[PDB]
């Protein structure tokens, strides 16, 4: 009977009432997987390059090209900073990955990260008014090992094209060295989305969840399952934001993190883990299950599910448990099971369940802010300033257990983030532009965003972007429904 | 007196009658440099990123991003070639430069090449239907010398992002090593626009120039001023197309090329000049002036900086001299100086003089053709096919001493280049897509270029690209005039 609308807004209604809750969840994930396959091929990707300058007539090329363009090359040679306003550089972000950790799918090979990086680049334009491209590279050295110095050298060479570097999907602990070095060696800001960007949105999420459960951040026990770059960065911001590290426990694959973890202390590449080891889990919990009894908050970024976070764990938590399970493409548990177990607030990293806690609602504002005041780097306080803007944006339009965080469907989030991030950067002493107010940044970010969204809509109404075929949609739903019944 | 039109078509008439020929030439140069400065700052560059996929509703992000995008990650991992259609890669060109030979300005530091590489990317979209971005890199090693191996390594790592690589503005002999190695090692086509690109359009102009003066290619004495990477490739294509090597002389800084250059002999980084030493200029001409008397064709692309072509060399040439002076931003001699000295046909690299012999009129068509049928390499044959296509397109609508070649205002040149280059790639055995006909390839090129042009036009007509202020046009004019009248 039911048929998807072109805007996909009625997917829930098109899934037969006969499916179980695990069948709806698995069908949702199969639909979007099969649809991704079809849509990417239909349009041959997701982004394109366009003029943004007047093409009124042939002779404009004499100013864009020879002979006129020569003044640009000499102006830049003599004053490198003018590359920021004479070329797209000022608004141009490289989305650099070696594809070693592309979502929960792992090392997907060097071109393998294109779908994800191209999606980041798309969201940067449409959400953030930022021009960005995917830069998927091979970081393998001559011995066939993915090598942090290969990526460091690369970015140092390519920095001159860009206004910021946005590292993505790089396995740990390479990603720490890559970022720790680049961030101080480059003349443009470099950061790792998976680090402060995930951490930023995770905090923003927790901030509002804590207002809805009426607890103070400092009194809350919190369990962190998985100890990769996202989770370690989340814990760090959460503590800076007022959480008591003594009430916190993190787990890697070998057990809990604590004083006695000599395996972690001796390998300094894992210094972020080792700091957590020195400062949290004073009780040295041996198991997740013990750690969760009474816990207030469970934050997971581990192996893709099903069944990695256990219903029993959640059942044993305190009053109005907050559960974030953000592994991709499949969360550690589906939201219907966690609510069955008693969770009051459940978040995942995907857009097809409520409460999407995903850096896509953080990077565009963090990046745009940093670009506008030319911040030298992305500081933790900047990241936190964006956590606050996002949490406050959502609160001020209404929040509840099934809507705790700003969504990708609310463009207003991003100039708010950009202006707060910009002022924090001036405050932290890392901005090179200091002559702009909160309002002036907001206005710049707002305009670029509106201009980006109106251009792209115009190109859709006119059918330079062709409508996707109704029939391929019908085919993706049948495909999804067949997988979970047949 | 007239003010400049929005479309810049009437600059000649806005330049005062009383100006001398020298003043008029210099004032055009200064006008376009000063307008380049103003317009690049006005739009903060020339190109932008834009969605090319449907954004009909929020849930679409679930296909473009987590969770759906994971299908793309794994699809690519298991079939790397599918990257060419599940992402922009299949139509994505990197304009790679170390900014070491950027026009006649030469080495402008790494970010200094951005003006020129952005104009190239702007042209690939608007003339060729190609998505392209500037990639300006630092190639300097620790000792601060430009290192070809750095460029080789860099491109090898980034190749995974792109459907082709378009090397630009790399100093010789580095450009040879980089091109020659990369074209064999990368799994996409790599070429150097200043090599086959420039030689493609140079041959095209020569073809029509020769028709106009009624001379057979093989019966012309040709003198080449400069042994740079452009001129070298110009000579080589012009020989393959049928010139007599015995009737040809090339000059470098130290005098004519001939088989007695021990000089060039053992430095095998310069093997291309060496092949030319073995095969040309049997006579051992002892000065450019000795060479030029009775010559038919004189071709210079001195890079960098200002080259020399003398009035007296031209005056000594034969019946109806053909003179190409393509140095940018100022040619070796201006057209009116070459005309006064007896030249019948004169080309420069600029669009503000007749007969613009510039790669911008060959690269959009070459790359587009190569991209469609997935050519592994850009062969010399393929470059030559584009030349015949360019020259024949021009001859069909009429050629004359002041209009010998197709212009950037004639968008039909490029689907025709694309289809001829494609067929040639199949014939050369470098095409990975072998069963499309000329018409099928033409159709794809034409449809892409038309979509790109109309998309761009819609964005201007809509005011998303703002009209450039008339007041600033008027200022640039006055500025230019003022520079020349004091
Ligand atoms: Na969610
Ligand atoms: Na010209």
Residue numbers in the entry:
A (entry chain B), B (entry chain A): 1 to 486
Which passages does the manuscript contain on this structure?
The crystal structure of EhME was determined at a resolution of 2.2 Å using the platinum single isomorphous replacement with anomalous scattering (SIRAS) method. The crystal belongs to space group P43212, with two nearly identical monomers in the asymmetric unit, exhibiting an RMSD of 0.35 Å across 3581 atoms. The monomer structure is organized into five distinct domains. Unlike most metazoan malic enzymes, which are typically homotetramers, EhME exists strictly as a dimer, with the two protomers deeply entangled. The N- and C-terminal regions of each protomer come into close proximity, forming a loop-like structure that secures a portion of the second protomer, resulting in a knot-like arrangement. The catalytic triad of EhME is composed of Tyr65, Lys120, and Asp193. Due to the knotted structure of EhME, two monomers engage in inter-monomer swapping of these motifs, contributing to the formation of each other’s active site. In the EhME structure, a water molecule occupies the putative metal-binding site, bridging hydrogen bonding interactions between the protein and a glycerol molecule. Notably, a sulfate molecule in the crystal structure mimics the 2′-ribose phosphate of NADP⁺ at its binding site. In EhME, the knotted structure appears to enhance structural resilience, allowing the enzyme to withstand mechanical and environmental stresses associated with its secretion.
